[PDB]
Design a protein around this nucleic acid. Structure first.
Ligand code: MG
Length: 276
DNA sequence: CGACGGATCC
DNA sequence: GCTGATGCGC
DNA sequence: GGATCCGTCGGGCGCATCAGC
């Protein structure tokens, strides 16, 4: 139950200082996270790119605080066409990307505001809020098709330029990514279909878990803890937030941090360092 | 989705 | 048009 | 009696719908 994140390695194995800092954070309501002081933490983090998930807020009700973010002025937003207070993603950046696409191509999937795709010269960054399987595993059939369609979309992106996937992938790949792995082997987040889903995505694009490459056998490292009861205090949680990287980016990986003590959601912020 | 408790092995 | 009471996804 | 395994339940968030003024 013990997890204090290691210190920030800001250099590469080749001695190269980190040039890039990406942050990803499911904000369980942008309008409820800004009031509980998350933009302040993001200002103490100084990310070059901030990727926000479950914003549940449309651009028209976008809080005004976003326009007082000085090193994060390029701001791209997605939302569901039908649902309000559902999903919603964000990409705030210091540099203006060459291209900002939204979605994954399959119109069926490009509806709930779950994917922003930003291209830069060295790399394409894709933020995401992957769909749940459901209480009762209802939309689990949907997830499996959605997965084939994201792994195929991202393989063709990685065909052109090195790829960094980040965000809430809604899956604990292995038993080290969750505290109670047996009580949830049939529950949402830890179904065998989705676990195999993750592994197929790692091999197909291909991709590597930024955290499990650097910390291969490090347990108790979680990114989400239920509001039911006091799971974050007894550290009962899951690792659903990740930094998936192209293999051609493992040489530039300095660190993948899980900022556990950053509050304001049911999720904690994850931060990446890269010498690119 | 963790708390909980039953329903089974030793 | 406000403002609490209740779904809904989770 | 417990170790374990597995099913059953019910209830913290944010938002936002719409009842009842
Ligand atoms: Mg959520």
């Amino acid at each position: 139950a013990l997890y204090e994140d290691p210190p920030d390695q800001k250099t590469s194995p080749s001695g190269k200082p980190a040039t890039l800092k990406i942050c990803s954070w499911n904000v369980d309501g942008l309008r409820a996270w800004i009031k509980k002081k998350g933009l302040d933490w993001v200002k103490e983090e100084a990310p070059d790119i901030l990727c926000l998930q479950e914003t549940k807020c449309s651009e028209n009700k976008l809080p005004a605080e976003l326009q007082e973010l000085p090193g994060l002025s390029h701001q791209y937003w997605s939302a569901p066409s039908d649902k309000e207070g559902y999903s919603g993603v964000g990409l705030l950046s210091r540099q203006a990307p060459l291209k900002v696409s939204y979605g994954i191509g399959d119109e069926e999937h490009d509806q709930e505001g779950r994917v922003i795709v930003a291209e830069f010269d060295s790399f394409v960054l894709v933020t995401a809020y992957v769909p749940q399987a459901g209480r009762g595993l209802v939309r689990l059939e949907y997830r499996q098709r959605w997965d084939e369609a994201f792994r195929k979309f991202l393989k063709g992106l990685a065909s052109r330029k090195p790829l960094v996937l980040c965000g809430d992938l809604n899956v604990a790949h292995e038993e080290i990514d969750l505290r109670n792995p047996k009580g949830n082997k049939k529950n949402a987040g830890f179904t065998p279909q989705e676990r195999q889903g993750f592994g197929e995505l790692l091999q197909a694009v291909p991709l590597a878990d930024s955290f499990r490459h650097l910390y291969p056998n490090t347990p108790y490292a979680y990114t989400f803890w239920t509001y039911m009861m006091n799971a974050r205090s007894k550290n009962v949680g899951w690792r659903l937030d990740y930094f998936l990287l192209s293999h051609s980016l493992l040489p530039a990986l300095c660190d993948s941090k899980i900022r556990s003590k950053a509050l304001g959601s049911d999720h904690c912020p994850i931060t990446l360092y890269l010498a690119l």
